[PDB]
Symmetry: C2
Subunit: 470 residues, 2 copies
């Protein structure tokens, strides 16, 4: 409740608060990755619309985080949003466990509820836990500057370990050990982390946060039709501030498509996994445990790049960031189409052995995505961070969240459109890959993103001209 | 965050806050009444070892309630007490549910925590939910007073339904269905209410509060030792009022021996239940489920009195209630030893029969405790409300909780005393009570309560002669 006391508002906060961060982030992977294998095997839904289902939860998961961020900053507290939404997911992620214990009519209503309740909690929690660990920070930071970025960096390459573990350990517990423990532990994980965080309310110092920027971006959007009827600095320097974001839009819209190549990764590649050359010597590998190559492919890249960035910046005379304003964004797109087409070539390189009459076959597509991801993500971030003012910086992260969600919603559209393409005989979005076609769909995304790549470079020459001529 | 809002601070306060009170209430009985049965044949403890582990829990469950009430009245609010101590209990009971599904040296280590975690949680929740949901009260009260008092009697005889069902179905879900669901439903029940509570942190209005007597009493004790070496209005008003709290004390001290008798019904009388004439036709009744006769006893003795109050107030010229101040306690203390006399007499009629070669036999004792309770409570409560200056009105519901907690401990002291002096060839409370002499343990209680109630009568004369002169 009162004014700062350095003998209370300290690491105690950094500890308990960020417990939920690992707890939530690891649950989103744990649940997310393998939800496909449940909706298929356990839930009986058709492969085409068993994937479709998942994207929309993921799509929500982010659109909710975008929607919930505003609620956080503008309404009743960035603290309370953690408390309200950790309690929302704990309820949602426990109905999922009870959903794996009680008994597709009523069974779906409960499932889609439990999922879009976990899509709700995650959206609110993720939007604040990160910014509440931050609320510790100081003016010129006396010792805080070193105390902060030592723990936070010791916390980041700590959740990387856990993120590998959610794909590795938790998928084994879901596929082999039964989804009762699989989802059940996630339920326990969040209830524990809720008391831990709420035990800390005391050792915390709540900071006065300003809810923006959209707050003004919408009054700009309302004055659209009062001006239609008409058809000092709020227009002199603020409308010319909103008209600067609409410029990110072409480049921003282009990104969405990478997140669909990243979506197809968890959906069908996991369903392709539940067939391909299974037995690993003595034991067996879980189908969904394939995403390890993407998590690895993600890790390794930024582990190498943030050691070789100097070697890029020295050979080619450049600014602090070793050729990544949007350069790294184009590179990701290049790999975006690579992974899809490789996955399409391999798709039939498995079929040309199934019809006429595996573990390594699905390794490229995942590995190519991870590399393409670490390149497109640290590109996207360090784009409108550097290409927007400080009262709009990190209100630029709002463009990242809409980018993601849109790509997952678009995969559902992409799969749904192809369902409305071929009805009779065998379509290219089947229930059985050993019977029906699928490589065709993997080529469609490989082309839709190859088209996008040429579409991107057109906007590349146009946006560089917007910051230099004007 | 700013001020009074009749169009905002509303009935969700009533709706969404009190459910935790309701959940906790069904969670304390549902676990409290059983537990002994779980520690008998599931955890495998001795009849005198398991029933003693219960009295410490339930005592500490109020010793905390006394403390949590002080936390709400002085530290980081009445909303935060609910927010912290519900999640704690939801952590605690989920550990207890996980205690009944995972694999005694390290099994009790996990079970005792999950217990005393439900105790710390339960305590803080009880001592702040009721006091926060009632936040609807207004100065002169504009149409509020009506909705206010009605909602609570649409809640108090709502939680009276479910408390009766907690002895009925929840016990049957444990004793028959399995302690997995038993504590499992108990756990989900609290994780749902905690989500609902925090969510409606809008249609809630919080008030600024301070809460004694505890503060001033200790501050008076501070002066007693700092002025020990010596052996203005605070000396004339603050102490002359503190002296008034030293007055309930002998009455308070006597009531302690009622909760010792009460505790036996929840613990030791559940061992006299399980071993006696089980089945009722085609379907059997759970051993713990005998408390329906106690719960029914209370609920009836209450409803019967709440009609035959005016009938005996008009016969014997009384003021607002039918000889309800300290005359009220007396009956409960006599009925306290009465059930200890009756149950002992029926014990030998259960034992002397078994050596010579049941469900009806335990109905008397449960009712006698229930009857005496609704009398001792409307005595203890309707005492210090009218028997202490209004600055400490209801700031003596502690002088209620302290009588309970100690009453539970005094029984834990009683069982440990009898075991050391009478053990181990022919013990009173042993591993097998048929191969032991139980009946005489009651004569220690029955006569103790007969002697304790005797000193109560010896005090009642010296009270309305030494306190009435003020």
């Amino acid at each position: 409740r009162p004014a700062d006391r350095s003998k209370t508002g300290g690491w105690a906060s950094a500890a308990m608060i960020l417990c939920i961060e690992a707890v939530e982030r690891l649950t989103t992977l744990g649940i997310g990755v393998n939800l496909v294998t449940y909706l298929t095997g356990t839930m009986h839904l058709g492969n085409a619309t068993a994937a479709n289902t998942v994207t929309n939860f993921l799509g929500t998961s982010f659109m909710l985080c975008l929607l919930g961020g505003f609620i956080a900053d503008t309404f009743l507290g960035r603290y309370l949003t953690i408390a309200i939404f950790a309690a929302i997911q704990a309820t949602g992620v426990s109905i999922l466990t009870l959903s794996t214990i009680i008994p597709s009519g009523i069974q779906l209503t409960v499932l889609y509820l439990a999922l879009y309740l976990t899509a709700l909690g995650t959206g609110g929690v993720k939007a604040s836990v990160s910014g509440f660990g931050s609320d510790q920070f100081d003016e010129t930071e006396p010792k805080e500057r070193s105390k902060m970025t030592y723990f936070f960096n010791r916390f980041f390459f700590c959740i990387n370990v856990g993120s590998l573990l959610a794909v590795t350990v938790l998928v084994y517990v879901q596929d082999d050990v039964g989804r009762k423990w699989g989802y059940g532990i996630c339920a326990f994980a969040i209830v524990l982390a809720l008391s831990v965080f709420l035990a800390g309310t005391n050792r915390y110092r709540f900071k006065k946060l300003i809810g923006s920027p959209m707050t003004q971006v919408a009054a700009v959007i309302v004055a659209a039709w009062r001006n239609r009827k008409l058809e000092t600095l709020s227009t002199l320097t603020d409308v010319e501030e909103v008209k600067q974001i609409v410029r990110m839009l072409p480049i921003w819209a282009t990104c969405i498509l990478f997140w669909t190549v990243h979506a197809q990764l968890t959906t069908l590649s996991v369903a392709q996994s539940e067939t391909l050359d299974r037995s690993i010597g003595s034991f067996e590998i879980p189908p969904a445990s394939m995403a390890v190559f993407y998590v690895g492919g993600l890790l390794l890249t930024t582990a190498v790049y943030d050691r070789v960035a100097i070697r890029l910046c020295k050979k080619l005379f450049n600014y602090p960031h070793g050729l990544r304003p949007l350069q790294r964004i184009g590179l990701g797109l290049f790999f975006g189409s690579m992974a899809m087409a490789v996955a399409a070539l391999v798709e039939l390189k498995r079929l040309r052995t199934a019809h006429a009459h595996g573990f390594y076959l699905l390794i490229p597509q995942y590995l190519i995505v991870g590399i393409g991801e670490a390149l497109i993500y640290t590109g996207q971030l360090d784009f409108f961070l550097r290409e927007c003012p400080k009262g709009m910086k990190g209100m630029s992260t709002g463009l990242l969240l809409s980018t993601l969600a849109l790509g997952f919603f678009f995969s559902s559209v992409l799969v749904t459109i192809v369902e409305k393409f071929t009805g009779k005989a065998h379509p290219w979005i089947a229930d059985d890959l050993n019977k029906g076609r699928l490589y065709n769909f993997y080529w469609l995304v490989a082309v839709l993103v190859a088209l996008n790549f040429l579409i991107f470079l057109v906007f590349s020459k146009w946006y560089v001209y917007k910051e230099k001529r004007l």
